[PDB]
């Protein structure tokens, strides 16, 4: 009787997390197996789609990233890896969970942003609503509005993007919105006029 090999990595039992900003051609992990006969062991990848994304070194089973990951496209996928002792091939699927980075700046909608109001428009009048979205996860996808630089006449609610008159106007006397996400380390911001 030949004793068929088995994979020993923790991630078959739980999952493998790979950050979306991992450089192409980097080594995500190395497959680990055991053969009771201490036969030589050969490591591969199974699947049309999987094959493109990942490469596996057959003597050791170092796994390499072949294609750019984007959490905002596909956050996770199943990949089947194989080990063979040359009697038989043994295949096991790992769950792979693309980790999010804050790789996206916010995006304003309705770019023709303009409105005209009477000189007499009283203090506290809401005059306009700006909308921007950010598709990164958590704080990286949560947008705050501010004027750049601040206005004595006009204020914008940081949460809702509502612009209201704070100073009395006078026709005979008389804007850059900055939308930013709230990522801790690498916040990304965008401007509209």
């Amino acid at each position: 009787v030949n004793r068929l090999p088995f994979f020993t990595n923790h991630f078959f039992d739980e999952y493998l997390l790979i950050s979306e900003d991992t450089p192409v051609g980097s080594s995500v992990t190395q497959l680990l197996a055991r053969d009771m006969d201490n036969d030589p062991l050969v490591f591969g990848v199974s699947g049309e789609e999987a094959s493109r994304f990942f490469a596996v070194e057959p003597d050791t089973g170092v796994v390499w990233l072949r294609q750019p990951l984007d959490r905002e496209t596909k956050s996770e996928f199943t990949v089947e890896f194989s080990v063979s002792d040359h009697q038989g091939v043994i295949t096991r699927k790992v769950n792979i969970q693309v980790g999010d980075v804050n790789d996206n700046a916010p995006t304003f909608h309705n770019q023709p942003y303009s409105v005209r109001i009477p000189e007499n428009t009283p203090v506290g009048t809401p005059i306009f609503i700006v909308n921007a979205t950010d598709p990164d996860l958590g704080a990286g996808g949560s947008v705050l509005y501010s004027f750049q630089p601040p206005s004595p006449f006009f204020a914008i609610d940081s949460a809702r993007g509502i612009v209201t008159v704070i100073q009395e106007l006078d026709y005979e006397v008389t804007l850059t919105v900055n939308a930013t996400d709230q990522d801790k380390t690498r916040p990304l911001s965008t401007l509209a006029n």
Binding site: F12, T91, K93, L137, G138, L144, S158, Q182
Partner: protein
């Protein structure tokens, strides 16, 4: 002067909270102990609101004060296997910062692990094969389990992988010793011992399918039975008749046929020479199928004393008819002692031999 901090992860690591549970986990299973979101959802003067969004089929339930998520599976199971096929769950923990009116979504991803909760099942109740008794040791005699025609297991990966092993059959002790599965992932059965149709024509092989759960205790098993019938093969030649077994053997008692021929009588008066008993043979293979495969039998005089017997005697090759070729003068020839041969005509003669004694009789006997 800015506390936008409430509804922000109080932990490091990527935004997404990711956990794994076993499939069919009990109801009330803690999916997430503590979301670790800055802020207070409870008490006299809360700073946040926590609720669940995209909670498809309400698998997930939240205690907002404890920031703890649970499995809701009263009346159901979380079945990873077909036909439910629930590999993962995604929900959103929505957080409102009451003070500044920010919104943050905390993505929870629950990977549902496969458990070895299904047994292999054989497509058919039982299997049948035939082996010609001449088949060499090592030949593959069955591949009947190929292409989902054997056992399959609805679990995933090693839990659904299948290994085939022949077992000891107390109802047929020699089966597990005449047949074997040298490559167990294939369940192709190879002959381990030479067959003899004369000894045993049917075997009852127990085959046990097992899945490849990592933990050996966790393996599930099924059995089936493969009936194997031996077909009679051309391993034996003729036997002359009559055939009367030597006590304690499979051997006919040797036969000496008898003839007697009057001296000075002509062939036309005497032919055909009657022999006692009648010369005839038969294949020792009692059940070659199909009948087309059954060889003919050739009859001949192999050797003879005296050695001039070819002058006086001819034997028909298909019928064993003996005919005198010229009259015998008993002053010159008192007798003949021949050996007869019967052999198959299929290039595998496996001959049988008998004695033929011929007496020459004097005039006025």
């Amino acid at each position: 002067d800015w506390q936008y901090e409430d509804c922000k992860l109080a932990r490091d690591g990527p935004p997404a909270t990711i956990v794994a549970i076993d499939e069919e986990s009990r109801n009330g299973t803690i999916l997430v102990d503590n979301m670790l979101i800055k802020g207070t959802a409870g008490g006299p003067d809360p700073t946040i609101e926590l609720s669940l969004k995209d909670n498809v089929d309400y698998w997930v339930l939240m205690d907002p004060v404890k920031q703890m998520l649970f499995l809701n599976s009263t009346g159901r199971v979380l079945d990873r296997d077909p036909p439910m096929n629930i590999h993962s769950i995604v929900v959103q923990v929505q957080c409102i910062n009451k003070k500044v009116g920010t919104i943050i979504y905390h993505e929870v991803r629950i990977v549902v692990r496969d458990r070895n909760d299904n047994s292999p099942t054989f497509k058919h109740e039982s299997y049948y094969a035939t082996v010609n008794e001449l088949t060499p040791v090592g030949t593959t005699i069955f591949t009947g389990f190929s292409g989902d025609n054997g056992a399959t297991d609805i679990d995933d990966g090693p839990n659904g992988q299948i290994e085939y092993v022949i077992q000891y059959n107390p109802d047929d002790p020699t089966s597990n010793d005449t047949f074997e599965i040298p490559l167990m992932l294939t369940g192709n059965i190879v002959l381990r011992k030479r067959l003899n149709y004369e000894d045993k024509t049917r075997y009852f092989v127990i085959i046990q399918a097992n899945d490849r759960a990592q933990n050996l205790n966790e393996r599930r098993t099924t059995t089936t039975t493969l009936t194997v019938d031996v077909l009679d093969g051309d391993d034996l030649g003729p036997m002359f008749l009559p055939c009367v077994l030597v006590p304690n053997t499979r051997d006919c008692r040797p036969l000496t046929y008898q003839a007697a021929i009057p001296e000075l009588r002509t062939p036309e008066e005497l032919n055909p020479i009657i022999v006692t008993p009648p010369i005839q043979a038969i294949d020792q293979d009692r059940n070659i199928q199909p009948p087309s495969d059954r060889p003919g039998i050739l009859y001949s005089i192999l050797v003879g004393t005296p050695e001039d017997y070819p002058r006086f005697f001819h034997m028909h090759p298909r019928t064993a008819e003996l005919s005198l070729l010229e009259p015998v003068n008993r002053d010159f020839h008192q007798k003949f002692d021949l050996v007869i041969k019967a052999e198959q005509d299929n290039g595998h003669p496996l001959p049988a031999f008998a004695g033929l004694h011929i007496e020459i009789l004097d005039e006025n006997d």
